[PDB]
Structures are given as structure tokens and as C-alpha cells.
């Protein structure tokens, strides 16, 4: 390997990207799914104070 | 020597970094008329280079499209590249580690670099969903199978 | 279920977030005079709360002790928490998910938070090496045998 | 290489960095189901330290407290310290260079750190407004005398 | 049985950790974080002359 | 001569933010092998915009280019926009606000946005030198302005 040891050689399926995952009309599965949440933008910075979000 | 009783494979990061940043708020002064979290959409793209045998350099380019109403809010794009040491493994899992697992290391760093630029435009809170880069290539090479035998390799 | 075939096993991340962050540079401009490899020690520890019914909150306390020479360079500590949907696994693996696998998910984000703050303190970038969390506990179990070591296996 | 620039005030940035970063959300899981109206309390505390001859460290402690009453949303603080080689000045010039000028350089970095920390705990984007330190310290100085405006062939 | 179907009746793996997630001084010296870092910092901030004022 | 000092202004920062960000390190993997002797080029541009009556946005286009001889290190160009509310003055005094004082206010944030991309790109922390844009306008204006008569009167 020279740098580390000996993996023989490390290719990538002929070509990396465009084989499946690619910015084109031919997308795979996954992406945009039930994960994470949109909170807000509310900074609430009134001068140098905010409020109390109770009840 | 890869022929003894030891921990399977050896992996070692060398250096992680941002190659490229872009943040365009095209309707910036006026798009602030829209007070809500914009319609976000994640779009991934990837490029690589072999610097060595046993050591590969991969780049996860992440792009977030965000738009308030019918006008674009922001377009944020990071390229998180990194030199990693992938050794010990063989077959499919060898180049799978640099091709899939290493972009997944780079994704958090790309993610915070995005949310930094969003915060600079002072747009709503953008947390990207946990997207496994492997998953898309894994479903494309799913029809194959390969239930191995219980026998561990070494580093 | 009633077998080792997990089959319907589900692991969906609901939300990742830092429940605690710390970064200190006690000797900062005195210690910047020392241009070399910061002597770093990573000390992890797991925490969680058994909420149950497929809801488990899991925290990963990731702590760095870095030092240039005989004095401190930088310290860092991030309690990276997250709620995980764990299901469809039985036996040892059942409860073992929240204590090894779920913290291992949190580590990409844990390391990210640290590495960011290291560079924000103008210290040499610190990429904490990606290790098998399962193996740190498994080391304890493989502390009885230490023999073997065959000749160079040709085939 | 060519530093022959001799004027009043020899101001030279060495680096702006974080001697301290903190973000504590011990109530983080439970607070995400609350109506978000915290007492966003922005604090600015600045200090200096003379390290050597004409070498001054200035630190900007920026604290953001967020509480929805007795409910803690989060606590955050970034002590953005920065080394500045300053010469030629004294008295009110020196006091104002340390008092306002240097903290104003530290502020954008400290602000990005805090809002990143708020984003890491996955609370909505909390960007603090531009606070002009040179405005605040304009009240202080030491001697109340700085008027001019008279016809003079010089600058 | 509500959030999904699967696991509800278990312990918290151990009592907390009962091991601590780190390197024990025994035989396998696993984990080496310090073997992954950039290690580089050299900058000359080119000063630009003008006048006294503020940024 | 005739000293023309700018008096009776109104200045209120409505919002400072990045409209455009650009970082480039396409040479990143092999540019780390390069002898770090960067030719860092600081370039400044100002574009004001009337959004409404006595509401003027100013944008500071700062361009930084660093090249290691024939091989480029990086590019850092940030168009730091800021909506301001200016009044009290017109003509040359209006131009003294929008073309001097306003991009001066934007410069700490332009600097920081650039600096952060450089450090994320694992290059040593780059801090832009303090530019007095008020001095830059004074050059074109007439090269004649001066206030200050600090007399110590206190018992």
C-alpha cells in the first residue's frame, strides 16, 4: 500500500457517483423521511430581554 | 500481518475539511417578509480521488434548497472532503468504507457548516435529517445476498 | 422474535441534540507557543434513561484532555443526547442497543461539536478516531485468553 | 515582509479564538414541548490582560440565558479571547482600544459560536443584534473632552 | 406497543454502564484518537494603514 | 481651505447578514502538501441600495485570494449585506454614510464569515486587517477632518 499497509488497491465500482445516486431523473429510494423536526425562527429578542412561555 | 486473532479491520482518519462553500440569498432583503421555516429539500452529490493505496480521499457535497412562498430564501452548499485510512478489509466492504461510511463521517461537519451560513443569513433553524449515503447504494445492490459464516478477521 | 431473526427490527432517530457543551483553553496564548502534536486523550462514557415502549433517550458524554508538553492545551466535553426508536430485537441485543449502538450513532455529532470548538480555539484540528463502542465493553470479556499467533497463512 | 507603516496606534491582530465555550440544556428533552418565549438575556462582559510589552489579550464574555420562567430552556456562554499587539497609544485611546474596539472584533465570532450552540441543542435560530461597544464605552472613556471642527490644512 | 411494537420489558443494559466506555489498562489497547489530526497553524495578518477609528 | 465635517446623522442597524458567501479549495488534498507561503489579496467593494425612504441597505463585497505560487491555496469572497436606516444627511454626507461608515460596520462580520470558512477548510486561521473605510472616503472627499482637545479638568 505504501501509506498504511496493503489493501492491494481501492477502486469504486468503475466510477464513483452517477452509477445510482446522482442529481438526475433516475433517483434511488431513501431521503426526505420521518426524521428531525422544524422548530421555529423566534429569537424573541426584545431590546435585551424576552418573556416567559407558560400556560 | 492480516492472519491472526485481533480486532477486525483498521480505520484511521488523517484530516477532515471543507473544500467549498456557497450561500446565495437571491431575494434576501424582501424574502424576510415571509416569517416561517422555508420549504427545505436536501440534494446530495459526491466526488473522490485516490491519494494512496490503503488511504482514500472522498468529498460529500451537500446542498440545501430553501424557499419562502414562490421566491428562494437561501441556497446553501458545502463540500466536506477528507483523507481517511481504510485497511484490513477486502472484497466489497473495503471500498464501501471510503465510498459510503467516510461521507457519513463528513456529513455532520457539512451539516454544521450549512447551519452556520443559514445563521449568517439569519434564516429559520435548519437541522438536516440523518441521511445515510450508504442506504441509496445499498438498496441498489440489495438484490445479491451474502449471509457469511461466523469467523472474525483481524486488522 | 422467538428466534434470532430480528426481521421487523426498527431503529428511527427522532432527534439529535447537545444537552451539554464545554470547551476550555486554560493556558491558551502561553500554550500556542508550542507548535506540535497536542497530546490528546479521549474519555467516553454512556448515559441514558429507560423510558421504554420503543422510546429510549440516550446520551454520550465525550470528553477530551489535550496537552502541549507538560501543560494543558485544550479541554472539551459534550453530552450528545438523542431519542431513538428501538424495537424488533430480543435476547442480549434487546437492551444492549441503548448502551452501545445508540451512543455510537451520537459520536459523529459528538466529535463534530468538539472538532469545531478545537479549531475555534485556534488549536490543531482534532478528529477523534471512529471506534466500535461494542468493542470497549467486549475488551473486558476477552481478558482471559491471549494465545494463538500462527505462522503466515498461505492459500 | 514590508511592515514600514508608522502612524498613531500600531494595531495588529494575532488571532481571535474561544478560551471558553459552554451550552447547558439539562432540561433539553422536556423543554422542546413548551411554548417558546424565553427571557433571552444578552450579557456583555469584557476584560483585558497585558501579556508582554505592547501585547494585550482582550476577552469578550458573551452570555445568553434562556428561561421560560423558572423553566430553563438553556444557558450559553462564549469567552472569545483574542491577542492584539497594540502600540503608540495610551490613556483613553488604550482604554477604548481594549474597552470597545477589540470586543467589537471578538463579537461576530462569539455570536456565531453561541447561535451554533443554540442550533446544536436544536432550539430555533437565536441571532443577537449588532451591539456597538464603541457606543457603550463612548459614555465612559475617562476625560470628557474630544470636540474639534476647526479649519486646519491636515488630517 | 405504542410508539412502535417491540421492546418495553428490559433493564438499562447494566445499572448505568458498570464498566465506563473507555480504554482499560489490561491487554487490548483499543481506541487511538490522537493518531487523527491536521496539526497546522501559521498566519501573517497583513496590516493595512489608514487612520484611527473603528470597524 | 474649507473643512466639511458630516453632522446631524441618524443611523439604525435594521439587520446585518450574509447575502452571498463563497469559499473555494478545489486543490484541497494536494494544497496541504504545498509550502504555506500564501499571497493573500484583500479587495473591497461597496454597493448601497434604497429599499425605502431613509432605509438603505449596504453590501460589503470583500474578496480574499491566497495563492502558493502557481497553485492556489483558497478563495474567500463574502458579500456581507446589511439593512440600515439612514437619515439626517444627503449628497456627499449620504455617500459618507453608505460608502464609508456602513461597509465599515459590515467589515467585522465580513472578516469573521471569511475566517470561519478558512478554519473549516483546515487552513490556519486568517483574520483580515482592520480597514478604516471612513479614512478611504476621506481620501476622495478632501483629506481634511479632525476633532479632539482632551483637557484634564477634574478636582
UniProtKB/Swiss-Prot annotation, chains A, E:
It comes from the Bacteria. The active site is at 34 (phosphoserine intermediate). It is found in: Periplasm. Belongs to the alkaline phosphatase family. Isozymes 1 and 3 are a dimer of identical chains, isozyme 2 is a dimer of heterogeneous chains, one of each of the subunits from isozymes 1 and 3. This is Alkaline phosphatase. It comes from Escherichia coli (strain K12). The lineage of its organism: Bacteria, Pseudomonadati, Pseudomonadota, Gammaproteobacteria, Enterobacterales. The chain holds residues 91 to 145 of 471 of the full protein.
Curated annotation (Swiss-Prot), chains B, C, D, F:
GO terms for biological process: protein folding; protein tetramerization; protein transport. The keyword rRNA processing does not apply. This is Protein-export protein SecB. Disulfide bonds: none annotated. Keywords: Chaperone, Cytoplasm, Protein transport, Translocation, Transport. GO terms for molecular function: unfolded protein binding. It is found in: Cytoplasm. One of the proteins required for the normal export of preproteins out of the cell cytoplasm. It is a molecular chaperone that binds to a subset of precursor proteins, maintaining them in a translocation-competent state. It also specifically binds to its receptor SecA. Gene3D superfamilies: SecB-like (3.10.420.10). GO terms for cellular component: cytoplasm. Its main location: cytoplasm. Pfam families: SecB. Homotetramer, a dimer of dimers. One homotetramer interacts with 1 SecA dimer. Belongs to the SecB family. The keyword DNA repair does not apply. It comes from Escherichia coli O157:H7.
Amino acid at each position: 500500500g505504501g501509506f498504511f499497509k496493503g489493501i492491494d488497491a481501492l477502486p469504486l465500482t468503475g466510477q464513483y457517483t452517477h452509477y445510482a445516486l446522482n442529481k438526475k431523473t433516475g433517483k434511488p429510494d431513501y431521503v426526505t423521511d420521518s426524521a428531525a423536526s422544524a422548530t421555529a425562527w423566534s429569537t424573541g429578542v426584545k431590546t435585551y430581554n424576552g418573556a416567559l412561555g407558560v400556560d | 500481518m492480516s492472519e491472526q486473532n485481533n480486532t477486525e479491520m483498521t480505520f484511521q482518519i488523517q484530516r477532515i475539511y471543507t473544500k467549498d462553500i456557497s450561500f446565495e440569498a437571491p431575494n434576501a432583503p424582501h424574502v424576510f417578509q415571509k416569517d416561517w421555516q422555508p420549504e427545505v429539500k436536501l440534494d446530495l452529490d459526491t466526488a473522490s480521488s485516490q491519494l494512496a493505496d490503503d488511504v482514500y480521499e472522498v468529498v460529500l457535497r451537500v446542498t440545501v434548497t430553501a424557499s419562502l412562498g414562490e421566491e428562494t430564501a437561501f441556497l446553501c452548499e458545502v463540500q466536506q472532503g477528507g483523507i481517511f485510512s481504510i485497511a484490513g478489509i477486502e472484497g466489497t466492504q473495503m471500498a464501501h468504507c471510503l465510498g459510503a461510511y467516510c461521507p457519513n463521517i463528513l456529513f455532520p461537519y457539512a451539516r454544521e457548516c450549512i447551519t452556520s451560513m443559514v445563521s449568517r443569513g439569519t434564516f429559520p433553524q435548519l437541522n438536516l435529517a440523518p441521511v445515510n449515503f450508504d442506504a441509496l447504494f445499498m438498496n441498489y445492490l440489495q438484490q445479491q445476498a451474502g449471509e457469511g459464516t461466523e469467523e472474525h478477521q483481524d486488522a
